[PDB]
Amino acid sequence: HHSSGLVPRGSHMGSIIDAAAAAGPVVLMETAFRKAVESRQIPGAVIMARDASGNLNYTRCFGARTVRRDENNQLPPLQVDTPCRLAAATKLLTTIMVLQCMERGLVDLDETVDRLLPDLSAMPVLEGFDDAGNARLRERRGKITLRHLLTHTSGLSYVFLHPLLREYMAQGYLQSAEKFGIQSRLAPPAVNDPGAEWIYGTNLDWAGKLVERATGLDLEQYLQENICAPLGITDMTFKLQQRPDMLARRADQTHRNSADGRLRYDDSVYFRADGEECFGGQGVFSSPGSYMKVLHSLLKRDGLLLQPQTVDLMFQPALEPRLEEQMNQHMDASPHINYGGPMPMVLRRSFGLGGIIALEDLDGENWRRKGSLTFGGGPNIVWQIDPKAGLCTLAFFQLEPWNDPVCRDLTRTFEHAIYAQYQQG
Ligand SMILES: CCC(C)(C)C(=O)O[C@H]1C[C@@H](C)C=C2C=C[C@H](C)[C@H](CC[C@@H](O)C[C@@H](O)CC(=O)O)[C@H]21
After folding, report:
1. Rounded to the nearest 5 degrees, what angle is found at the Cα of 274, between the Cα atoms of 269 and 277?
2. Atom 30 in ligand 1: which residue has the minimum CA distance?
3. How is residue 405 annotated by DSSP?
4. Phi, psi of 127 (to 5 degrees)
5. What gap in Å lies between CA 70 and CA 252, rounded to an integer?
6. What is the DSSP letter of 21?
7. Are 111 and 145 in contact (CB under 8 A)?
C-alpha cells in the first residue's frame, strides 16, 4: 500500500513501467529527429502542425540554426521564431498577393499580361541554337495570362533547369543581367508557348511585378500591409539586410557535400544581399512560426488574407487533361527534381493556384487526402494544407540541396505520426 501523505507512484520495476503507456507515433518520431541532430546528420529542424479548431497546436524545434560556432563557442538553436530563407516557399505568399488584387478588382485571372507586363509580352521564345553559336529566337504563339503565371504554364523556365537556357547562359547572354551575384529572374527568354506544357519557372517573379504595377506599391510594402499586418507578423520581409534584429538571430544555410555527406557552412549570396528588386518566386525571409500563421489562416478560412471562396479556388485542379497528364509524366520521370518532396514518387496530381494538388489519397486514410495542396522551398522546407483531414503541416530545415534523403525521410515520419494520432474524419 502507498505511503502516508504521498502520491501512490510506481514502487518497483513492475508498476513503474506500467505507470505510463507505450510510446505513440509522435514520441517515436521526435526521437528520430533528436537522433538525426545528435549523430550530426542534420543541423536542425522545426516541425509544426495545426488543425482549425485549435485542439492541435504542435511545434517542435530540434538542433541548431547553423554549423558555425558563435562567440561563446556554441551552436545556437533553431527556434520557431528564427529568421529563415524561404526560397520557393515564397511562391504561396505571392500567389495570395495576386489573388487579393483579383478580389479588389485590380486584375482578372484570364486577362493577358500585356497591359501590366509589356516587358514579358515582348519576350521571345528560345527555340534552339544555330551551329555558329547563335540563339534562334521566335515570336510567342498565343498570349500569357495571369492564370498561366500562377499555374507554371506560361512557357517560362529556370536557367538552372532547362538545357536550352543552360546553354544560353554559357554563351554569355546573361552576364549583364545580375547584381550582387544575384541573377535577374526577368531577363531570360521563354522556352515554350503558353498553355503548351507545365514548366517550373520564374512565373511568380513576374506575377510579383504585376502586383507592384497593379497597386503602385513595391512588393515589400504590399507584403507588410496585406499579409503581415492582418496576421500580426513582424518578421517577414524581402529586405533582410534592413533588419538588424533579424540579422543578429538568423539561420545560416547549411550544405551537404555530395562526396562525403558531411554538413558544411553555405556562404549563400542570398544571405549577404537582398538584391535591388523583390522576386516573388524566392525572396522572402521569415520564421517557421509566421509561415504557419499563413497556412493556418488558409486552413481556417477565416477571411484574414482572402475570402473563403477565393481560397477554395487555390485548391481546384487548374489543368486541362492534356496538361495534367504531361505534368504527371514529367514529375513521375523526375524524382531527381522531386517537386512534391515527401509525397510518393508516383502519384496522380494536378496544379492549383499556389501549389501541387493531390488527386488521390497518398495512403488511404493513413496520410494526406485527395484535395491536399503542397509545395516547398530549396532548403528542404515543405508545407501542405489538407482540408479533408482538417490539418496543415510544415517542416522547416535550412539545408541544401533540395530533396535531401535524410530530410525527406524525417518529414515523411513527422507527417505520418501527426496523421496517425491527430487526423480527424
Ligand atoms: C531559386 C530556387 C527556387 C526555384 C526558388 C526553389 O526554391 O526551388 C526549389 C523548390 C522545390 C519545391 C523545387 C525545386 C526544383 C528544382 C530545383 C532543384 C530547386 C532548388 C534549386 C536550388 O537548390 C539551387 C538554386 O538556388 C540555384 C540558384 O539560385 O541559382 C527546387
Report:
1. 125
2. 160
3. H
4. -95, -25
5. 12
6. P
7. yes
Pocket test for ligand 1, best of 95, 267, 402, 403 (most atoms within 8 A of CB): 402
Say what the resolution is, in angstroms.
2.0
How far apart are the C-alpha atoms of 86 and 94, rounded to whole Å?
A: 12
* Residue 79 alpha carbon to ligand 1 centre in Å: 24
What number does the ligand 1 atom closest to the CA of 200 have?
15
Q: 399-400 and 253-256: which strand pairing? A: parallel
Q: Which residues contact 16 (CB under 8 A, 6 or more apart)?
A: 9, 10
Q: How many Å apart are CA 102 and CA 85, to the nearest integer?
A: 28
Strand 253-256 relative to strand 381-386, pairing: unpaired
Cell triple for 167 = 546553354
Question: Which residues approach ligand 1 with their CB closer than 6 A?
Answer: 87-88, 158, 160-161, 200, 281-282, 337, 339, 375-378, 400-402
The C-alpha atoms of residue 347 and residue 332 are separated, in whole angstroms, by 8
CA of 159 from ligand 1 middle (Å) equals 11
CA angle 351, 158, 151 (to 5 degrees): 20
Neighbours of 318 (CB within 10 A): 22
Q: For residue 2, which amino acid is it? A: H
Domains in the chain with CATH codes: 1-425 (3.40.710.10)
DSSP 87-123: GGGHHHHHHHHHHHHHHTTS--TTSBTTTT-HHHHTP
Q: Which CA distances in Å does 201 have to 111, 187, 264?
A: 20, 12, 28
Degrees, nearest 5: CA angle 21-23-29: 165
Instruction: State whether residue 373 is helix, strand or coil.
Output: strand
For residue 16, report the distance from its CA to the centre of ligand 1, in Å: 50
Q: Which long-range contacts (CB under 8 A, 24 or more apart) does 230-236 make?
A: 230/304, 230/305, 231/290, 231/293, 231/294, 231/297, 231/304, 231/305, 232/293, 233/286, 233/290, 233/293, 235/81, 235/83, 235/286, 235/287, 235/290, 236/93, 236/284, 236/285, 236/286, 236/287, 236/290, 236/291
Amino acid at 115: R
DSSP state of 224: I
Q: What's the alpha-carbon Rg for the chain, to the nearest Å?
A: 23
Burial class of 314 by CB neighbour count within 10 A (0 to 12, 13 to 18, 19+): buried
CB 397 within 8 A of CB 344: no
Which ligand 1 atom is the nearest neighbour of the CA of 183? 30
**Experimental method used, please?**
X-ray
